[PDB]
Amino acid sequence: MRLINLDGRIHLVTGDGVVDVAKASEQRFGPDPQDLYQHWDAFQEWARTAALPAPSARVGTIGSPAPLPRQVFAVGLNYDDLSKPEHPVIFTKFVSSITGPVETVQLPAGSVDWEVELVVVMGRGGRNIPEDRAWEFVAGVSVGQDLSERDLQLAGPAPQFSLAKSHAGFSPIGPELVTVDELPDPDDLELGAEINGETVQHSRTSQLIFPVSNLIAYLSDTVELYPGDVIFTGTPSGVGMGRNPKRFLAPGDELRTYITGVGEFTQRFVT
Amino acid sequence: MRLINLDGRIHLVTGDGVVDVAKASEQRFGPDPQDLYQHWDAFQEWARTAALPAPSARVGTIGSPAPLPRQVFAVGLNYDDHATESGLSKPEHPVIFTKFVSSITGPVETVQLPAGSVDWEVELVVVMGRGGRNIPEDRAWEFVAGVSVGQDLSERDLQLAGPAPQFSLAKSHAGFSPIGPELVTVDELPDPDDLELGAEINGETVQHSRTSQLIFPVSNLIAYLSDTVELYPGDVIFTGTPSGVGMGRNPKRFLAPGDELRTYITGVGEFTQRFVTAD
Ligand SMILES: [Zn+2]
Ligand SMILES: [Zn+2]
Numbered sequence: 001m002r003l004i005n006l007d008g009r010i011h012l013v014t015g016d017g018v019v020d021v022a023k024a025s026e027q028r029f030g031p032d033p034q035d036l037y038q039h040w041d042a043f044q045e046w047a048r049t050a051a052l053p054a055p056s057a058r059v060g061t062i063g064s065p066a067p068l069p070r071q072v073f074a075v076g077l078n079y080d081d082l083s084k085p086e087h088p089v090i091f092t093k094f095v096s097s098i099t100g101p102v103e104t105v106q107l108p109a110g111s112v113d114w115e116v117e118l119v120v121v122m123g124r125g126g127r128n129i130p131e132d133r134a135w136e137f138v139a140g141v142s143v144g145q146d147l148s149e150r151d152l153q154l155a156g157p158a159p160q161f162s163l164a165k166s167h168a169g170f171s172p173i174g175p176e177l178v179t180v181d182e183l184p185d186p187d188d189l190e191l192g193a194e195i196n197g198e199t200v201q202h203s204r205t206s207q208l209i210f211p212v213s214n215l216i217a218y219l220s221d222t223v224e225l226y227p228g229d230v231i232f233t234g235t236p237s238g239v240g241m242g243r244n245p246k247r248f249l250a251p252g253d254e255l256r257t258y259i260t261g262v263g264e265f266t267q268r269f270v271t
Numbered sequence: 272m273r274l275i276n277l278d279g280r281i282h283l284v285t286g287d288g289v290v291d292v293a294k295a296s297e298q299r300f301g302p303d304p305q306d307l308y309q310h311w312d313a314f315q316e317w318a319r320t321a322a323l324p325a326p327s328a329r330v331g332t333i334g335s336p337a338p339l340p341r342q343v344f345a346v347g348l349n350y351d352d353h354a355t356e357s358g359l360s361k362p363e364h365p366v367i368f369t370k371f372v373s374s375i376t377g378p379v380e381t382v383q384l385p386a387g388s389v390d391w392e393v394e395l396v397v398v399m400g401r402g403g404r405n406i407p408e409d410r411a412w413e414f415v416a417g418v419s420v421g422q423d424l425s426e427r428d429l430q431l432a433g434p435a436p437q438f439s440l441a442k443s444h445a446g447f448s449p450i451g452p453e454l455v456t457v458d459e460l461p462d463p464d465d466l467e468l469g470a471e472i473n474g475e476t477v478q479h480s481r482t483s484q485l486i487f488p489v490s491n492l493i494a495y496l497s498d499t500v501e502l503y504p505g506d507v508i509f510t511g512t513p514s515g516v517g518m519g520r521n522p523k524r525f526l527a528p529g530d531e532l533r534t535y536i537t538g539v540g541e542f543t544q545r546f547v548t549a550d
Contacts, residue, residue: 070339070372070373071371071372071373076435076437077434077435085433085434086432086433087429089434089435089436089437090437090439090440091369091437091439092368092369092439094342094369094500095341095342096342096501096502097500127445152499155364156360156362156363156364156366157348157360157362157366158359158366158436159435160347160367160368161435162367162368162439163367163499163500164499166499167499167500168404168501219440222385222429222440222441222443222444223371223373223374223440223443223444224373224445225373
C-alpha cells in the first residue's frame with residue numbers, strides 16, 4: 001500500500017492515480033493524515049476489502065505522510081560505513097520542523113549539513129515491543145532529511161542535538177508512506193543523496209548499527225510508542241562535516257534525496 | 272485564574288471547588304485541556320463574563336494541566352549552582368532537549384524506579400497560550416497561558432552514557448514528567464520571574480531556590496526557542512532545576528524504594544510522590 005498527503009488530505013495511491021480516503025470511505029477515515037494512524041488496523045482492513053472508486057489525477061501540494069506525530073525519535077551514529085555505541089543515541093526533531101517534500105528550504109546562518117534517512121512511521125504502539133515482531137508495528141516507511149545546523153548542534157557543554165535539527169523545514173518527509181509489504185527487503189534498502197547531481201551519500205540500510213526492529217524495541221523499553229510516531233533512523237557517511245575540505249549547503253544548491261523502492265525528492269536552498 | 276485536569280476533563284478552579292469547563296461553556300471550550308490553549312484568548316474572555324454553576328468538589332485523577340503538548344522543551348543547566356554541581360561548564364545559551372509526551376503525567380501518588388540512578392529536579396513549568404516564531408523577549412510573558420510545578424526525573428546512568436550523550440530518553444521513563452496539580456495564570460504571581468521552588472525527600476530539604484536565579488529567564492527561553500522553532504499554544508517548557516540534585520552531592524544520592532519526594536513552588540502548588548521498584 002502507498003499513501004500520499006495532497007493538500008492536507010490523505011490519499012491512497014492506486015494505479016497511476018489517487019483515491020481520497022475520506023471521500024471514498026464516506027468520512028470513516030481521514031482526511032487528516034495523522035488521524036489515520038489512530039485508526040490504522042481498521043483503515044487497512046477497509047482499504048484492502050472495500051470497493052474503491054476509480055483513481056483521480058495526482059495533483060496538489062505534497063505534505064508529510066505523518067505531519068503531527070506525538071513523539072519524534074531521531075537517531076545519531078547509527079551507520080557502519082572502533083567501538084560502536086552500546087545503545088542507540090536518541091534525540092528529537094521538533095514537530096514544527098516537519099514538512100512535506102517541499103521545493104525549497106531556508107538556509108539559516110551557520111553550517112547546514114545533509115543527512116538522508118529512512119523514516120519509519122508507527123502503525124501500532126506499546127512498551128516493550130518485541131524486536132522479532134517489530135516490523136508488524138510499522139505502518140510504513142518514507143524518505144527523510146535530517147537537516148542539521150552543525151554549529152548549534154555541537155556547541156557548548158554536553159551538546160544536545162535537537163534544536164539545531166529543528167529549524168523550519170529541517171524535517172521533510174515524503175513523498176509517500178510505503179507499507180512494509182512493498183519493500184523487497186525492509187532491512188536492506190539502498191539510500192543516498194546528491195548535491196547538484198553529485199553523489200554525497202550512498203549506502204544501504206543493512207548497514208544500520210541498530211536496525212529498525214532494534215530501534216523500535218529499544219525505544220519502547222523506555223517510552224510508550226504511539227501509532228503515528230516517527231523515527232528518523234540515522235544517516236550513512238558522506239555528510240559535509242566529514243568531507244575534506246568540509247562542505248556545507250550553500251544558496252542555490254539542489255539536494256536530491258532517495259531511497260530505492262520508497263521514493264525521492266529534491267529541494268533547493270535559499271537564503 | 273487556576274485550571275486543573277480531572278479525569279482528563281479541564282476544570283476551572285472557583286473558590287474552594289471546581290467547575291467543568293465543557294459543561295459550563297455548553298461545549299464551546301474543552302473538555303480536552305489542549306483545546307483551551309489553542310483558543311486561549313477566547314476562553315479567557317468567556318470565563319471573564321460567564322455565569323458558572325456552583326463549584327463541585329475536586330474528585331478524580333489529577334492529570335497534567337497540559338497532557339498532550341505538541342512540543343516539550345526541557346532546559347538543562349539553567350541555574351548557576353546546578354551547572355557547577357553537574358561537573359559541566361556553565362552554558363552560554365540554553366541547553367535544550369525534550370521529555371517525550373508518553374512520560375507526562377499529573378502528580379501521581381507513585382513512580383516506578385527503573386534500574387539505575389534516579390535523580391530529582393524541581394522545575395517551574397511554563398505552558399504556552401499563544402504561539403509563534405521570533406517572539407520578542409519583552410513580550411514573552413504575554414504568550415504564556417500559565418505556570419505549574421514539575422519534576423524532571425532523570426535516570427543518570429542512561430543520561431550520561433555512551434558517545435555524545437543525549438539527555439531526553441533518560442528523562443522520559445514512565446511517570447518521569449509529572450506536572451501539576453494546577454495551572455496558575457501569570458496575573459496571580461506577584462513577580463512571575465521570581466518564584467520560590469524546592470523539593471524534600473522524607474521531609475528533608477534537598478532543593479530550595481528562587482526562579483530569579485534562572486540563568487536564562489522564562490522570557491529569554493521563549494524568545495530563544497522561537498528563533499529556531501515555531502512554539503504552539505499548549506506547548507510545555509521545563510525551565511530547568513536549581514542545585515541540590517542527587518548526582519551533585521558527596522556522596523551521590525539517588526531515589527530509593529520507599530522514598531517520598533515532595534515538590535513545591537510557593538504560592539503555585541505542591542505534590543508528593545513515593546518511589547517503588549519493580550521487585
Ligand atoms: Zn540524523
Ligand atoms: Zn531538568
